[model samples]
Target: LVYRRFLFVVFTVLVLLPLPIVLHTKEAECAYTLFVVATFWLTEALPLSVTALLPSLMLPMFGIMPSKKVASAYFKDFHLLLIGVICLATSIEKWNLHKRIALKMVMMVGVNPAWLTLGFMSSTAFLSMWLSNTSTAAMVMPIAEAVVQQIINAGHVTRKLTCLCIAYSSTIGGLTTITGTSTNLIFAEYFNTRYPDCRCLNFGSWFTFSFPAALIILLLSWIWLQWLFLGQQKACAEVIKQEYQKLGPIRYQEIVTLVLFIIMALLWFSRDPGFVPGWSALFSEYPGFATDSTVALLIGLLFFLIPAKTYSPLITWKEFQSFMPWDIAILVGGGFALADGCEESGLSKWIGNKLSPLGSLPAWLIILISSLMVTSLTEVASNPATITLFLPILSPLAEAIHVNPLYILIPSTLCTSFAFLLPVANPPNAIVFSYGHLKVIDMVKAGLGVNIVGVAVVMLGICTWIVPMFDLYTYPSWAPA
Candidate 1:
């Protein structure tokens, strides 16, 4: 309460008091508001969603934007696409398909303790690339815990390695695709809001650019997690076989959900790939009708419409209300609102001018430094808050440096998911910590090395693959704000 009170007082003072040495009053106020938002988000002074509601309420009243304009920024294709993807992913969870897929893959990997560790990491990481890492961690942790306990009962080594790997894998997995993580969408949303014309930053292009790097990082993560104590432990074959038997049978809903998930992936990829004429071109006459949102919603809608063998829909509306993360949508809406306010208040241009001197630093060095900074920031700050606060600032900084805006921005967004060192860093970390298997020291000893390796991989991946793959080595003319 004291924290919130102090912040509210600062927020009010910033809004009311004229600051010393500012070019314009509104720009300074907006900047102060951004800091307040980040402060609240970091402390979790309120539910992140409730805190995000600040923009919709305060922006209009402060004259930063009209009520109508502020409301408009709260929802967009970014929000819809996120909602659609989560709904589909939730359906996957509701049907227990993700669990079965993970278990079967692990069973196939055959429970040599080292391979078992690799198998769990591989499964969780792949699922994470498609589902929320939070969900992926929760789903896989039970299975990992069971295996670890069983191994301990067999007189082999015992450790929190199972939970740590799941937690770590989930965070790393999100870097693989655009929809793989919420921050990725935040990056896309801000990019769209800031540069409405930069059409190339789409699903297929991002996957092409991010997949190989994701694969490599994941493999290294396996190597790193195995490096400590778990590498030499033995696994009991019967324990895994018993665990597999518990799944009972693969049902119709699982197959339907899996097929639909595959279809959604196919649609998201083939819709606008640069290599091939996309489905969108066929509907080019419709202009803005087809998009990543279109496929996501179209496939997601089927979960409600299609019936299972038991004669019930795959997912009920009531279930969706429970499953879909409305808080995330609101949190992101707050982000868009902040980004919108920055642009409208002329704060973006002001900051751009201030940062224009950094153009002399080589782009690779800029990327590494940004990766290091953002990696540390996100370890403490909320991922969405980190991106929202920095995007407006980084955009202008990138332009000032003569590097493409995304050169710094993309790595910053991806690096947010690299929060492996602390329990507070990400939801997956918290989930694993709560299981009582992991100690703070256990996490620190393991997480620090992976964090460093993760940053290097993210930096190298963006510079070597992502930039050229997206053709963002130079600013695209289409991106002019």
Candidate 2:
């Protein structure tokens, strides 16, 4: 906080704007606005949200957009869905429901070191699909530390595999669904704006692409973690099993929360499920009531109404007030605003023209390049900010090329969240490292492996399976021109 990080001040553009400018020059100015935001975000000289506000200041100052409308671009339906989900996560934590589910899973999986790693990975991954990644990782850290302490007591351990597993798996799980990460939601909003007629970026459609990829990536990370830390060794599960038994029986509130969680997933997936008539079509009689946000909020509201013996209700309105990820929500809004400004100023199209030469390259090569750019950029920067800045440009680039816009768009969106090599790469990484259980070099050693593997998994996983599954190679009629 003490550091004063400086960047180019855009107000100087006043002198250059005295002469009439063409479209390309206006686009250049917008690009400069984005560059300033990106610089402050990367440096952390100011808070990410503070840097994001630069758009609110720069876009209007340059006449790229009027003040009243740019103010409105900050919120979207997914933003509400995100808030509802964050509230749901807060309730799950407040009642200790997440802990119960996690310990039960670990107990069932058996706690040998390798199995423990798999158990942690599986539980965190599953929770992440429905919960926030940083919260999920933070929630699981104590449980992991307790067991990790026991493992260290038995013998001197060289690596913090449990710590790393909790952090890494939480991140991979986020790619599974739209609610999983702000990055995914930002992608959805951007894709929807770019190609409004395409149904490919919906909750169900996204699950079709991301769920399997997340599952595969999670498995790959688990195996490599076992090899790195477990080798041929085994650790007993008695401690974990005993901890699970302490819960005695599932409470009424746990059942309510767990059931609502399941129902919420079913609602999102079945609302527009691929392969069959979705409930959304079935519910076309009342289009007003059926959307991912509507369902998420519906389920979230019940937590405050349902009774719990401990808290008088499953989750109090007071509890939701805390831990809502409000800052990240603001950042999400800022991203939407920046993306909107890029389009309004034609910077997105301009960037697309520059990358048009890559249209001639093979799809596989293009995916690889995009994957590397996303993964490397995310490693040193904010994932949400990275996607916010890139997707506007990439969407147009995909259109400029002959390939389906999603071919590169989806892979890049998912890949940007795969920053495993540094503590600063993501909040989950920072959360785990703050506990002092892992070292910078240890993560680099483990992260480099995960990072490369993650990129390959996303690039090839999307190209070989997702494109065919989604019929993306054939440009959809709905894609924007």
Candidate 3:
């Protein structure tokens, strides 16, 4: 508590004090950029929402962005959409819909213990593709715990193996899509704003491009987990028929929540400019009315309307409020404000100019160094802030070198999500660690493998497949040949 107070006092003093003489002499854009950085750093050090509020409150005070603009950024369609999704997820948790779905999937896969594990991991990975990783982990953690407990009771598996599998699989499942993990959205939004022409990926597009890689990783990770934990433990061929039977008949509330979730997913992926444009256009004569966000909102609203005696109120306003991570939301908004400030203040341009010497380097060498450096940097700082700080420089540097910015920007942004090894490295890892079974060494051992594989896959895939397929930026016809 004393340390926390001391940190807070120091931050307050920094924010309240007059600008440093050095800062005062700097360009307005540079000064504003530093102010944004300090604000973000302080907020992150404190509570996440407090960090978020800085953008709305501080940006206007600093004369960095208008008050209305900051206000408007808060109400973005995506933010509201995420709110609605959270509400629906809350309802699912309230009614035990997720457990029911997991149990049903397990039964369908035939109860062979190994297959059961695979089934659980696959369902988890797929669910995470559409939902938040934290939510996916929260929902699955209990079931995984239960299965582990059952195995322990039967004297088949150790507590350590069960705990490790739960931790590792839950973390890996998040890599499946843009919305799967918070970092994915951060990278997506950063890429979208920083290089609009290379805006080749939307929610659906990203899912298609990433899902395959995610699945490969998931499969490999699953094998690695089993090997690392229950090595050579022959599958218990016998089904836990009694245990399975005790779960009781599926409840009506569970069915309703499941249906609502499926419907929302369909709407999210099938709505306007659907996964495949040609097919989506052919299927619907009229433009799609609902967006992913709208679908999330509507599904959440259904929770209030649906009658569930098990949980007296299906989803009360109080429950919704409790589940909402207002702090995280604020953090996201503050990040946006910071990114905007960097772009507007010309801080990005200044940084880009300083790095112009890199233009003489080969494109692959530039990409390799830039991606690795950005990935390494984000481990210590906020990923979005790191991107905001470097993107401005990378963009013009690419332009100066006559290379497509995507070559550098795409890999660098994606690599930011590869935070492994530390508790604060990524939110999903941090949340998983909160369960208390995982040690830093445990995370590093497993994460190091994933991180190494991720770097290779990202570099190879971007160079050979993604770049050529997307037709990203190209050099001028008159550039040196």
Tell me, by lDDT, which candidate is best.
2
- The TM-score of candidate 2 is 0.89
For each candidate, C-alpha RMSD in Å?
A: 3.4, 3.8, 4.5
Order of models, best TM-score first: 1, 2, 3
Cα-based lDDT for every prediction = 0.75, 0.76, 0.64
lDDT of 2 by residue, 139-243 (tens): 888777776676565433434777788889888888878878778777777766667666655666666666777777788888887777657134355555566
Point out where model 3 deviates above 4 Å.
1-44, 105-117, 155-158, 190-199, 230-239, 272-291, 310-313, 380-393, 473-481
* Residue 187 accuracy (lDDT) in model 3: 64
User: What is the number of residue pairs that collide in model 3?
Assistant: 2
What are the runs in model 1 whose C-alpha is more than 4 Å off? 1-24, 154-157, 231-235, 309-311, 471-475, 478-481
Q: What is residue 480's positional error in candidate 3, in angstroms?
A: 18
Tell me the tens digit of each residue's lDDT in model 3 across 72-165.
6554445766787787678777877677677667656764456666777777767776777667777777777776665545433444444545
Which residue pairs clash within candidate 1? 359-401
Could you tell me every candidate's TM-score relative to the true structure?
Answer: 0.89, 0.89, 0.83
In model 2, pairs of residues that clash are none
